[PDB]
Amino acid sequence: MELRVGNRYRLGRKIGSGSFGDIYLGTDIAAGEEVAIKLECVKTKHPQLHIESKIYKMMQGGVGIPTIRWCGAEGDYNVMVMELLGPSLEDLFNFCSRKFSLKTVLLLADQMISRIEYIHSKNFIHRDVKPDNFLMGLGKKGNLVYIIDFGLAKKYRDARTHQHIPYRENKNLTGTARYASINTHLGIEQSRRDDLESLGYVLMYFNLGSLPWQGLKYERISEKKMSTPIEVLCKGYPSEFATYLNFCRSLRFDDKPDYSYLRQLFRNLFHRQGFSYDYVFDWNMLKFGASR
Amino acid sequence: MELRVGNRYRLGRKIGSGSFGDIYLGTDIAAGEEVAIKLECVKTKHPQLHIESKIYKMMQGGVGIPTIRWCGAEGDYNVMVMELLGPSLEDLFNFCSRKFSLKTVLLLADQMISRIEYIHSKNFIHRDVKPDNFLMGLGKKGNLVYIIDFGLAKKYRDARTHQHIPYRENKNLTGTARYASINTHLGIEQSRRDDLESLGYVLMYFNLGSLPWQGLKYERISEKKMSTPIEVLCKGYPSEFATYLNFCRSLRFDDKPDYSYLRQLFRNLFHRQGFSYDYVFDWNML
C-alpha cells in the first residue's frame, strides 16, 4: 500500500539529509501541497527534533525562515513537517558550473547577512553557516534566500536580560570544518562573530570555486586556514571581501557586530560596479547561455 | 629501575621549578602523552600544592587554562600532573633574539589581558605576572596563550558576598621584583590593579628588550622604577602603552578595572597600523 505519515502527509523520496536526520519529500494529501518531512527515530540516544522544532516556532514570522506545517509522532518516528523550498545555494552553485559572478555574490551576500542578523536578534547563533543551509524560495518568493537547519543552533544570551554567555572553551557539537571560523578550530565557544566569519568563507567560496584548504584532516584544515593570510585568499577580488573577513576576525567575543556596515561595504561596491538591484541571478541568465 | 610516579607516569628530566615545587617532564606510560609533573615534599611546614591544584580545578573550562590530569600521594611527595604546554613567552622572546614586532606584541597583549580578566572573574589575583608564566599551546592550539602557576594566587574577594579583601600594608614583595608593581614595592596589599600594572611592564619589556631597573638588589630596582617616568619608559613607542600604565597606576585598591577599555586601546592601534588578523607571529617568520 501507499506509505503515509500521520493522517494526511503522503511520504515520498528522500531528498536529502541534515543534522537531525534526513529530509523526505512529502505531499499534504489534504490540500495537495508538496512539503518537506524531517524524520527522527525514537532512539533516545540524542533526541533533538523537538528542540530544533521549538527554535523554528520561535523564529517564525521572520523574513526567510521556513514555516513549520505540523509536528508529531508516527511509530518509531518524531516528525517535523515544513514548507518545501527551492534549490539550495550549493545546488545553484553546481547548476552554474561552480561559478558565481560578482553581482550574484553581492546580491546573495546582502540577504545572507540579514538572515544571520535576524537569527541573532532572536538570541541564537546558527553555528553551521554553509551554502547547503541557504535555500531560494519558490514562486512569488523565488527571489528570497531562506536559512534552514537549527540543529547546531545555540542561544548566545539570556532572552530577558540579554546576559551574554561566558568566554569559555567549547564543549558542544561542531559544524563544517571548511567554513569554520578560526575560534572554532582553537576550541573556543562560538558567538555572533563566528556566524559572520563563516559567511566570509562562503562568499570567497562562491568567488573562488574552492577554498585553499579544501581537498586535503581537521588538524590540517586548521593549519592551512591559519596559514593562508586573508590578503592572499581574497587576491584578485575587490578589497571588500578581505575587509569583510578582517572586520569579522576583529570582533571581540561578546561584541555586537555592525551589520549595517557589513551590508554597506557590498552595497557601495555594487553601485560602483554599475549593477542594478533587479533580482536577476546567474541561474536566471543561464537559460540564454551563461551563468557568468 | 624505571622511576614511576603513581604507577601511571614515568619521571623525566627536571624541566624547571614552580613557585613552591619542582617541575619534571613526565610520560603517561599508558597514553604515551608527555605531561608536566609538579612535586611537593610531604614534609614542608607550608604545603601549597593541595591548594594550587584546587585553584586550577575551579578554573577548568576557561580558555587558556591548562588541565590537571592527576593528583597523587607517593611516599615522600604529593603529586600534581597537568598537561605540558609549549614554550613560554620568554623562551620564544629569547629564541627571537630578544625582539618582538609591534603586532606580535599587540596580538599577545589581547590574549594576556583576557587571561587576567578571567582569573579576576573567578575571585582571584595571580600576583606573579611575567613572560615565564605564559605558554603557547600545542598543535592547532599553538596560537593560544595559556596562563600558569597559581602558587601565589589569592582570593581578592569573598566568593558569595564579593566583598573585597581589606586594605593592608607592611606586606612583603610576593613575586618577581622585575615586574612587581610599585604598590607592591611599597609593601601594600595587592589587588587587581597590580596584576595589570605588572602586565604593563611585561609589554614594555617586550618592546624595549629589557628594563631600567634590570641589571643593577630589590631596593635598587624600586629606586629605578620609581625614578623612571612612564613617558621616559615608553619613549619611542605608541602612547597606548603609556596610556595603559597610567590607567593601571591610577586605579584604586578595590577598583574593578575596565579590561575592555585597555583592550580597546591595543585594538585601536592594531587597526590604525593597518595590521591584518592572521595568526603568524615573529617566531614563525624565522
What distinguishing features does this structure have?
homodimer, 292 residues, alpha+beta, Phosphorylase Kinase, domain 1, Transferase(Phosphotransferase), domain 1, two-stranded antiparallel sheet, 17% strand, golgi apparatus (chain B), phosphoprotein (chain B), ATP binding (chain B), serine/threonine-protein kinase (chain B), nucleotide-binding (chain B)
Describe the structure.
Two copies of one chain form a homodimer. The first copy, chain A, is an alpha+beta fold and 292 residues long. Chain A has two domains: 12-25 and 36-85, Phosphorylase Kinase, domain 1, CATH 3.30.200.20; 86-289, Transferase(Phosphotransferase) domain 1 (Transferase(Phosphotransferase), domain 1). Helices cover 36% and strands 17% of the residues of chain A. Chain A contains ten helices and ten strands. Chain A has helices at residues 49-58, 89-95, 102-121, 182-186, 192-208, 218-227, 230-233, 239-250, 259-273, 282-285; strands spanning 4-5, 9-17, 22-28, 33-41, 68-74, 77-83, 124-125, 134-136, 145-147, 154-155. Chain A has a six-stranded antiparallel β-sheet, with helices on one face. In chain A, strands 7-10 form a two-stranded antiparallel sheet. In chain A, strand 2 and strand 3 form a beta hairpin. In chain A, helix 3 packs antiparallel against helix 9 (259-273). The longest helix of chain A is centred in the middle third of the chain and has 20 residues, at 102-121. The first copy, chain A, is globular and about 60 Å long. The N and C termini of chain A lie far apart (47 Å). The relative contact order of chain A is 0.12. The interface between A and B is medium-sized, with 22 and 19 residues. Chain A: Residues 9-270 form the Protein kinase domain. Chain A: Its EC number is 2.7.11.1, 2.7.11.26. Chain A: The active site is at residue 128.
